[PDB]
Amino acid sequence: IESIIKTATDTVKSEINAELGVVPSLNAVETGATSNTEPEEAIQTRTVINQHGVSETLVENFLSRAALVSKRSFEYKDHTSSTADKNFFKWTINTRSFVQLRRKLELFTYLRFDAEITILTTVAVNGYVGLPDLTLQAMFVPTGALTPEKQDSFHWQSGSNASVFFKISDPPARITIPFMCINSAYSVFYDGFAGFEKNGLYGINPADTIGNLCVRIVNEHQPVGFTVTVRVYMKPKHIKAWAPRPPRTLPYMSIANANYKGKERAPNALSAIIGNRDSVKTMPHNIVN
Amino acid sequence: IESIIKTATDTVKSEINAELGVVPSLNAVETGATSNTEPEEAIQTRTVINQHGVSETLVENFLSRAALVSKRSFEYKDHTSSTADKNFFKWTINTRSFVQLRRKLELFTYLRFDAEITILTTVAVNGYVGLPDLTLQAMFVPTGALTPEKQDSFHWQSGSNASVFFKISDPPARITIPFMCINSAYSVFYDGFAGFEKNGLYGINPADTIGNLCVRIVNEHQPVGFTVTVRVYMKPKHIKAWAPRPPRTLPYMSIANANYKGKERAPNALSAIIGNRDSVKTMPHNIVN
Amino acid sequence: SDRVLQLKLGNSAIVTQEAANYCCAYGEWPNYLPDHEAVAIDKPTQPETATDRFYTLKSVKWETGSTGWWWKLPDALNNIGMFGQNVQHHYLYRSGFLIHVQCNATKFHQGALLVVAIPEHQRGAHNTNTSPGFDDIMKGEEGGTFNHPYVLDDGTSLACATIFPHQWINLRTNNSATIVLPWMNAAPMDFPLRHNQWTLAIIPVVPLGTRTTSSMVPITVSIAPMCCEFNGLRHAIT
Amino acid sequence: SDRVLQLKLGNSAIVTQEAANYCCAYGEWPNYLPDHEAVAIDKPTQPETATDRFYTLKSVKWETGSTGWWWKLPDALNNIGMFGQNVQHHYLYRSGFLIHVQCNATKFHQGALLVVAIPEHQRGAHNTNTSPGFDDIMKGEEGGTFNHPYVLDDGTSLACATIFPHQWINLRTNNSATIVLPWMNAAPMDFPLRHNQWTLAIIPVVPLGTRTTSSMVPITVSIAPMCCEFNGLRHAIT
Amino acid sequence: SMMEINNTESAVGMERLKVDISALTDVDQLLFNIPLDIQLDGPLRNTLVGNISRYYTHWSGSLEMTFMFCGSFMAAGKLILCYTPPGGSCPTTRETAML
Amino acid sequence: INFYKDSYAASASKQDFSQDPSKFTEPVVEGLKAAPVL
Amino acid sequence: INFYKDSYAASASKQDFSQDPSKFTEPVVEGLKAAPVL
Amino acid sequence: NLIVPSESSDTCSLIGFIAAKDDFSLRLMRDSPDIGQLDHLHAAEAAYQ
Ligand SMILES: CC(C)Oc1ccc(C(=O)Nc2cccc3c(-c4cnn(CC(F)(F)F)c4)ccnc23)cc1
Ligand SMILES: CC(C)Oc1ccc(C(=O)Nc2cccc3c(-c4cnn(CC(F)(F)F)c4)ccnc23)cc1
């Protein structure tokens, strides 16, 4: 039954028992219920008034911290001879590329949230003359819109796409993206195929497609080359979460799938997740005096 | 009849019909009215309580996003020998030069709006020593006022013209221009001639003339040359719109007229707007398993 | 009193004399889609007892080397009876399921099956970058076998799978498991041929053992769809 | 006002602009079987819009030599859509029918079709003692052609067939006929594969004629089962 | 607004906005089909619903198709117009489309 | 937040949910019924 | 502090202390007593 | 079938139309793929002269 829980539960004092037909420490795991044995039933307890708050394990607090989702470096230079990100890049938006945020998100089956996006830009001189204060444009290109082909293409005029223009000397640029799934929740996992034929992608729900982030330098190139690095952070907020999942153990292989190999030996090998001890009778860090 | 609509309409359940003299799926297109057949009349429906909002298709939201209307590059240098924008330029204000905003505006015959103007400036060193933090002046020169002839002419003293002075290291400069037509609405299209003689321009309403934007660098030239690029964005706001129009299909040719040529082949050729399929019986992306 | 259970749905009934309660996943029960959650506006067909009945799949042999078995829903039932015909003729489907898993042995046998219903059990392949193909996933009535049950074939772990709806069959204690699944999807309905809401998994965490004379020990799976709805009447994809 | 009619059932609709009222056979309307008339005690499936919809049969050419056409119900529909699947999976069936017959031609054409629904149209053979065989009777969707429409292929007469539920298509006047049939049987339900309640017959009492350039003049039959019930869920006979 | 259903080579300009029907000598023949992708370049793109919707990424709700017959007063006929929900191939026979 | 003296300075007015599509869908002098149009 | 017009712009909602762990710990149709489970 | 007399044209035309109903809704505004430019329009430069 649903109730409001702000602090951990109190302990009541308990006495000796000795009752026939009452066995609170016996349980039946086959039902699928977890053990309902209370500490007051297992041992003699004292009264403890418990004041420990539970706010830090709220799903909102557990998930709503900003994490890196995209990092891209490119050359800001005269690109007339290059083969390359020619003063701009396109990113197909995903949340699976950096494992810290990915693993936390994958503790859940369904998530509904708004995304706070922070864009951090940094610049170095190519192998010094000072660092230029560049203007950048980030343009959100949804599904079925045309992406820019060039730094100076007319796609950047952004008649209806959301663009943010920001300087390197500014604080990091920030926008919120609304929860934009065509369903009521994102499918964090998807046991299905994207298309009506058999050749569509496994494991990606088409309902969750965000689109493209296109980022250019707006300045014309300088006589000298720079490396620009863009970092994108996402913070989920206003979060609802459903059906918690067993956590990822094996290293991720791919952003496209759940494929697994494991480490060559324990921990997190396919044959042994926990590191080995000599025997079930060995206490590995036993106190000896 | 006018009513307030915030969400899409609900669907009622419907039963079998079989009524003589009642034929809701039959229509008469020759009247000019669109079909009034409801889904409840065409098929058996269930009840659906519809919660989908309609705010994103408000004319205010559809039009009030900032779009590029002017882009100009010029040399910031000693111009004593040049032929050129000699540290300043004049722009005859128009909204027809960039096709994304133009095509959206041309979905309507008459528009009344205030214009939010954002000015973005960027600088590169000519073919490096760092980038200078220049001061620029933008001056609105209405109809019949004198425009500057030189970077240092006394027109720039701006006794009664609106000027904004802004730095490159600032955020983009922003002002709102009021709705300033001599009529109650701008004429987006104008089936007429500008003058009382026959030689005036076709297709421009004199009532909609805004004036000139004159932009100079206020600094004296440096010993080295820079390219300055100015970008002007307009955002319509407080918008009223009348008489929706069929959209532009063929590429624009000119800012001065609606002249048309089309692409050499479909799509958007003069003979064929939609790309061809083999026959009226061919399903181009047919699902096959 | 919680060891004997009769399940009756349509023209089918199951009795068991050694249950261990039963699981209602997340405390939910199946229900039809209410009007305040509806999307598709055509009137649904609700076939009731024609579809809301137990279908019994082919039994699998529990053997000493067994890694476990899995079946995907609705895929395992998409070709069975009047449920399958409605699946083939309609674009959209919605239902719950009643799952009953059956395994009996002697009082001299030992062994424990984890019986777990996994929502959106998106599989991984082992030791490759290539995603699982259509024929790796879509097994139909036969179902599949676990490659690496210890990581649930998805880089995760068996040990933590008890976060999902489950019972155990412990041959010492019980010969059957029952799980009731609600509709479990982000959308209110789905196309039944390209997405599976639920995977049933049966994994022998304790292997089958005895020193009596050996017999074949089958595991049998019976599944009743519950509150089936279908929308978008069409020809059969079939 | 009685010349324009729209019929809507499930996901299907028919409009006509030249009807001539419509017939409700014996003044009845289709209804479900009430409890005071029920025999079989299992809960019926009532698929509603999945079955209670128009099915359009193959069109037949009206030609100068045509003797007329017939289709038996439920037999003509027993293999079509979700109606056919329920027929194949259930021992027992009950429904009404909505019959719409379609034939248009120019204002320079002439011709009259008697469109008649015959209950228990037990056929005779011509000039033999041997009763009609299974393949003479069971035609399915294609239907049959009349051997001797003047005696209705049963030693009787066409002239008196207007005692049965009927309309006419008179090309001068109307391009469609509609007949609504109730359940018409001595038993409250029947096995759909061995007995036909109704035969639709279309007989050209006045032949097709014109002196304009000839075109193919098809006759099209659309039939909606109404209030379909099925009992005795089984595997498919199929 | 008018669909460009006859988006075929050898239909030029206004010829692309009409479909021509003739008397047939075989029963129940297919006359034409209409692709329903608004995103891809089909008959629906250059329409009022089409052009406005392509400023957006998501859409929901019902569409109406109306057909006006522009033969002579003396022309007669019956057509069947069928919508097939997705999941299989486009139907090529009337007995399939009728479902 | 608007501390400017001219009301045209303000932010956009996204609150007008009034519609009348019948001026474009049904500009017929006699309204359609649910019913032969002609 | 939220002067934006869209409510999705707001700061995070850290106030929902409602829990129901029994949907995960006790999804049994008949609840456990304090008492032989089986 | 289409059935016509000798003095009517043997071939007849359909015009097809589409509209949204009032249950229709649109979301997530984007730049339309139906328009673009690779060059300055004619007389665009002359706005600066
Ligand atoms: C240019 C400016 C104006 O607009 C911008 C728009 C967007 C961004 C940007 O980078 N956004 C994002 C980056 C990474 C992930 C997301 C997701 C997301 C992915 N997956 N999920 C479900 C989950 F978690 F369950 F997997 C949710 C949703 C929306 N945005 C995302 C940056 C800028
Ligand atoms: C220097 C500072 C102090 O003052 C400034 C004043 C103005 C600007 C500037 O660039 N303004 C503008 C640029 C582009 C178009 C317009 C329009 C307009 C054109 N056409 N229409 C009707 C339509 F849409 F229907 F066609 C409306 C109206 C007012 N301004 C405009 C920049 C700065």
UniProtKB/Swiss-Prot annotation, chains F, G:
Give the free-text PTM comment from the record. Myristoylation is required during RNA encapsidation and formation of the mature virus particle.
Compartments where found: Virion
Query: What is said about its interaction partners and assembly?
Result: Interacts with capsid protein VP1 and capsid protein VP3.
What does the UniProt function comment say about this protein?
Lies on the inner surface of the capsid shell. After binding to the host receptor, the capsid undergoes conformational changes. Capsid protein VP4 is released, Capsid protein VP1 N-terminus is externalized, and together, they shape a pore in the host membrane through which the viral genome is translocated into the host cell cytoplasm.
Please state what the protein is called. Answer: Capsid protein VP4
What organism does this protein naturally occur in? Human enterovirus D68
